Amino acid sequence: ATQGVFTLPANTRFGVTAFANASGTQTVNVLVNNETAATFSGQSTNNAVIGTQVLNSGSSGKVQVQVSVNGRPSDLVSAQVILTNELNFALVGSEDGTDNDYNDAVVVINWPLG
Amino acid sequence: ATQGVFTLPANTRFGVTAFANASGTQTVNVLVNNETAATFSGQSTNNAVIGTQVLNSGSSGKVQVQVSVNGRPSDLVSAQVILTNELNFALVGSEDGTDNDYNDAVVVINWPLG
Amino acid sequence: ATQGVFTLPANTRFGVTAFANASGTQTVNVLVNNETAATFSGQSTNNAVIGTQVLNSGSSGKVQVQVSVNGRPSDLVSAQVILTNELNFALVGSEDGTDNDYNDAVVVINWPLG
Amino acid sequence: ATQGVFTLPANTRFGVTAFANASGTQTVNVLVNNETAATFSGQSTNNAVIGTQVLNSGSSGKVQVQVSVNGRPSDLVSAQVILTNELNFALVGSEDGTDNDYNDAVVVINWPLG
Ligand SMILES: CO[C@@H]1O[C@@H](C)[C@@H](O)[C@@H](O)[C@@H]1O
Ligand SMILES: CO[C@@H]1O[C@@H](C)[C@@H](O)[C@@H](O)[C@@H]1O
Ligand SMILES: CO[C@@H]1O[C@@H](C)[C@@H](O)[C@@H](O)[C@@H]1O
Ligand SMILES: C[C@@H]1O[C@@H](O)[C@@H](O)[C@H](O)[C@@H]1O
Ligand SMILES: [Ca+2]
Ligand SMILES: [Ca+2]
Ligand SMILES: [Ca+2]
Ligand SMILES: [Ca+2]
Ligand SMILES: [Ca+2]
Ligand SMILES: [Ca+2]
Ligand SMILES: [Ca+2]
Ligand SMILES: [Ca+2]
């Protein structure tokens, strides 16, 4: 099934944070309404925060995470969890290889902020 | 119910990252086997990362997050989610005041790394 | 934090299903817009499905789960998970005693249906 | 990503319950250590319970859920959620058609019991 695609409340600020855990350079692209809004790149096998940014969900609320390693798309997993009916996390894992740890790039989206 | 307490696989490296969304300084303590292993503090109303670190779960695997603001422990909410039976997230939200947004300090624990 | 309260899409059918795992008779009450819409009850230490029902979330979409044992309110834990941005589960555990297994009555809410 | 595969604690009872929301008969197979341990069949567009059972996770703790409709394997989505470090839910959705509602057979696994 489609993964790494979330519908947020419209015109709402959210945080997006990417972590790396692989030998190869991870490229994370965050798209809002089908247009790239942040990009982070880096290599780490120690969960380096390769980028964090505050974005606005815009008119559509559509947020999509894509991950690649030197041009090759990684396979994604994702889900959303809501705590106390108020606190939202959208979670992405990605796999660039064969070991299926799905941690090669890890992306966490959180809202609301402030 | 108890919140902010997670059993990790023993002797496993994990990532812990905290964000702030509140007027007051957040202090985040991360305990491993009931001893403080990391402490983060900072202030942001824009989801700033107030700390990130890699720790080991130790012999017991017992990890606990506690949050203090303005001299008092915040009310916690938490859950653990596992994606594709491989990728683990331990998620914590906290409330230091009256509005119940639960985002005042947000803590993300992830494993495995590497 | 408040637990057992979920905001569902307005005017939308959902399934609610309750399981029992305790020596005492569980009573599960499902409130829609602050009014009892369903009540399930039974006694099992083997996950008996003490009730299942389809309800409509109504104009507000507010849904609350309350559990009691021998006329005493059980402590609740809850969260909502969303799969592939489309499939929703609202999850409730409850504790009636001292062992903190939180499985004494378990309630699963699922939408959409059809 | 592989979906509908869960590692449970070894030799532990768990509940498995399946619901149907589709025009076609859903067949749900539950495998423990790669051997079929339960099979549920049924048809409903109203979230009817097509089966419920308690099974033992065995020496491996490997549990896999498979869903088919008239012999055709359904695409799965899944996750595991743990509340208060105690109560576990393994959640599965499936899609047999083109509408991607992923509720055609919904499977809920829960543990511990008792
Ligand atoms: C070559 O494999 C890549 O790098 C390794 C060090 C591991 O992080 C593995 O998960 C990843 O897919
Ligand atoms: C008396 O304690 C109650 O019954 C027992 C059989 C257990 O299921 C326990 O979790 C429950 O709280
Ligand atoms: C033919 O399509 C199947 O039956 C319909 C009644 C819907 O439940 C749909 O989601 C399902 O895939
Ligand atoms: C700016 C405000 O600061 C504190 O009062 C928080 O509890 C609120 O949620 C908000 O972040
Ligand atoms: Ca990998
Ligand atoms: Ca890796
Ligand atoms: Ca607050
Ligand atoms: Ca706040
Ligand atoms: Ca109990
Ligand atoms: Ca019990
Ligand atoms: Ca369908
Ligand atoms: Ca359907």
Residue numbers in the entry:
A (entry chain B), B (entry chain A), C (entry chain C), D (entry chain D): 1 to 114
Lines from the paper:
The present study is devoted to the PA-IIL lectin from Pseudomonas aeruginosa, an opportunistic human pathogen capable of causing lethal complications in cystic fibrosis patients. The lectin may play an important role in the process of virulence, recognizing specific saccharide structures and subsequently allowing the bacteria to adhere to the host cells. It displays high values of affinity towards monosaccharides, especially fucose – a feature caused by unusual binding mode, where two calcium ions participate in the interaction with saccharide. Briefly, the structure is tetrameric with each monomer characterized by a binding site containing two calcium ions and a saccharide.
Hence, amongst the four monomers that form the asymmetric unit, substitution of the sugar occurred in the four monomers of PA-IIL S23A/Me-α-Fuc and G24N/Me-α-Man, but only in three monomers of the S22A/Me-α-Man and S22A/Me-α-Fuc complexes and in only two monomers of G24N/Me-α-Fuc. In case of serine at position 22, the hydroxyl group of the serine side chain is able to make a hydrogen bond with the carboxyl group of Asp96. When this serine is mutated to alanine, the hydroxyl group at 22 is absent and the side chain of Asp96 interacts with a water molecule. Previous work regarding the comparison of PA-IIL and RS-IIL has hinted that the reason behind the different affinities may be in the composition of the specificity binding loop. These observations are further confirmed by the results of the current experiments that point to a very special role for Ser22. In the absence of the side-chain hydroxyl group (mutant S22A), there is no hydrogen bond to Asp96 and the available carboxyl group of Asp96 binds a water molecule. This is in accordance with the observed entropy penalty. The S22A mutant displays a significant drop to a mere 11% of the PA-IIL affinity, its dissociation constant being consequently almost ten fold higher (3.96μM). Overall, the S22A mutant can be described as both fucose- and mannose- binding.
